[PDB]
């Protein structure tokens with residue numbers, strides 16, 4: 001119990017900021033995650049032995065793909081940590097437990113291919129899960145790891161608390177299906193504006209947690225420009241591999257997945273920022289004002305992409 005994780009001074013300070021980059025030292029990422037659980041949740045939330053074993057099994061079940069990898073999992077969990085720390089009083093003890101774990105697990109066993117590619121390939125997962133295919137898989141993988149001997153980090157919760165946290169985790173992971181984000185944000189936009197948004201209404205909380213999951217999942221667009229730009233390479237490495245596999249099925253991929261249209265990436269980023277990112281962080285900032293730095297960083301990166309198009313970089 002008297003055992004804390006302590007980070008070096010620069011990390012200890014910068015980890016509190018939304019735009020923190022977890023760095024290139026893979027062996028520090030578990031400790032960074034444990035540090036965040038302890039400060040966000042308490043040193044009591046989890047048996048450290050069970051947590052460490054859970055973390056290492058989750059890492060093993062992430063694949064060596066360019067973007068949807070173990071670094072992405074820890075990066076998404078850090079954005080959730082920053083949201084939770086800037087909104088201390090808004091979230092229950094169970095929600096803080098669930099959401100950091102949900103973020104770590106949200107892309108478990110990702111192959112670097114979209115739901116669309118799985119359906120067109122006719123992958124077995126697409127037969128098992130007709131919508132949110134990869135996301136239902138990610139939740140299935142999470143439950144599987146929780147049920148390994150010595151890996152049940154929730155074992156000290158009551159029966160009712162255990163069912164509530166697994167339900168928080170299921171909804172949180174499903175919500176990372178971007179197809180579901182558009183309608184979820186529209187509903188939240190209507191509720192905030194007509195003044196009907198009520199955080200004591202569970203269906204309303206579910207929607208707000210959904211948006212937080214989207215915000216954390218997209219947080220590559222909220223880093224300093226050098227991080228955002230280098231992450232974009234990893235994102236397009238997966239998209240273009242998927243586009244290659246579409247061409248192998250005899251289907252022309254959408255331009256975003258066609259490496260022959262590299263030139264139009266900057267304009268592709270504008271659409272993404274305007275159609276998804278900016279709307280996402282705007283609504284989150286309306287509901288949770290202290291998440292404003294995410295919207296500010298997103299707008300800064302939109303302006304950097306505009307400068308790339310105008311030939312200035």
Ligand SMILES: CNC(=O)c1cc2nc(-c3ccccc3)[nH]c2cc1NC(=O)c1cccc(C)n1
Nearest residue numbers: 218220235255256261264265267268269272276
């Ligand atoms: C819903 N629209 C998009 O997801 C999206 C559409 C795009 N269209 C282009 C494009 C258009 C013409 C020529 C070349 C490229 N690039 C795109 C990139 C996109 N997404 C991300 O960059 C991104 C970032 C982070 C996380 C996720 C899930 N996605």
Ligand SMILES: [Mg+2]
Nearest residue numbers: 106107134176
């Ligand atoms: Mg995902």
Ligand SMILES: [Zn+2]
Nearest residue numbers: 106107176217
């Ligand atoms: Zn993700």
